[PDB]
Amino acid sequence: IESIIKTATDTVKSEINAELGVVPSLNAVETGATSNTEPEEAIQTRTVINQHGVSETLVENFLSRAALVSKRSFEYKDHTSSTADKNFFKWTINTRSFVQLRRKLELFTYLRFDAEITILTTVAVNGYVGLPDLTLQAMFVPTGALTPEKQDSFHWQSGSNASVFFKISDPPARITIPFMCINSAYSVFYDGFAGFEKNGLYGINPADTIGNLCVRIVNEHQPVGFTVTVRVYMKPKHIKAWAPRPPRTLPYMSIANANYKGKERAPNALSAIIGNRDSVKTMPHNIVN
Amino acid sequence: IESIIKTATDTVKSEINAELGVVPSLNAVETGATSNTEPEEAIQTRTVINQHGVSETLVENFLSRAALVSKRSFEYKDHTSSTADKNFFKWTINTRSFVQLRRKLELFTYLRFDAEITILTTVAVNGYVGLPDLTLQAMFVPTGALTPEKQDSFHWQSGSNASVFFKISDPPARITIPFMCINSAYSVFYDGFAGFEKNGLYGINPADTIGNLCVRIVNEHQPVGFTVTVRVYMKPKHIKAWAPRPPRTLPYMSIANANYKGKERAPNALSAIIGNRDSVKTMPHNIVN
Amino acid sequence: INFYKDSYAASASKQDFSQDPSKFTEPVVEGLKAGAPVL
Amino acid sequence: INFYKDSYAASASKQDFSQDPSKFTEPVVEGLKAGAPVL
Amino acid sequence: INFYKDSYAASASKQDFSQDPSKFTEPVVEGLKAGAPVL
Amino acid sequence: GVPTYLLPGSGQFLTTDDHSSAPALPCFNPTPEMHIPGQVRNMLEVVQVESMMEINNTESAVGMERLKVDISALTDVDQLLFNIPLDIQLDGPLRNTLVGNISRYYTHWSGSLEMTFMFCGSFMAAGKLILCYTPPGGSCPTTRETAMLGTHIVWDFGLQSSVTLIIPWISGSHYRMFNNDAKSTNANVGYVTCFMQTNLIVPSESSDTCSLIGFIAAKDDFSLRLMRDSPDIGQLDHLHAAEAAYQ
Amino acid sequence: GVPTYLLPGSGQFLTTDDHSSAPALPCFNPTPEMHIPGQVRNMLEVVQVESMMEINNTESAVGMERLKVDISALTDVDQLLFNIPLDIQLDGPLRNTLVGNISRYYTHWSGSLEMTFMFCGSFMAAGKLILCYTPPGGSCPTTRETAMLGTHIVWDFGLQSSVTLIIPWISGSHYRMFNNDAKSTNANVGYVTCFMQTNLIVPSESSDTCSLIGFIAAKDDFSLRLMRDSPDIGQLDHLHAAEAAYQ
Amino acid sequence: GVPTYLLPGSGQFLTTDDHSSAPALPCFNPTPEMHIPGQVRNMLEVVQVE
Amino acid sequence: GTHIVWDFGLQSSVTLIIPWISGSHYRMFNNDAKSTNANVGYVTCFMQT
Amino acid sequence: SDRVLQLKLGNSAIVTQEAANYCCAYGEWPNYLPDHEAVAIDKPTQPETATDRFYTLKSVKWETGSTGWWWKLPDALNNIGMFGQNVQHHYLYRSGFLIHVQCNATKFHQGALLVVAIPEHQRGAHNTNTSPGFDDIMKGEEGGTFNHPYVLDDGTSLACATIFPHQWINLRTNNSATIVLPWMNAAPMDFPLRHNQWTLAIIPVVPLGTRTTSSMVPITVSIAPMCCEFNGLRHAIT
Ligand SMILES: CC(C)Oc1ccc(CNc2cccc3c(-c4ccc(C#N)nc4)ccnc23)cc1
Ligand SMILES: CC(C)Oc1ccc(CNc2cccc3c(-c4ccc(C#N)nc4)ccnc23)cc1
Question: Is B208 touching ligand 2 by the criterion CB < 6 Å?
Answer without folding.
Answer: yes
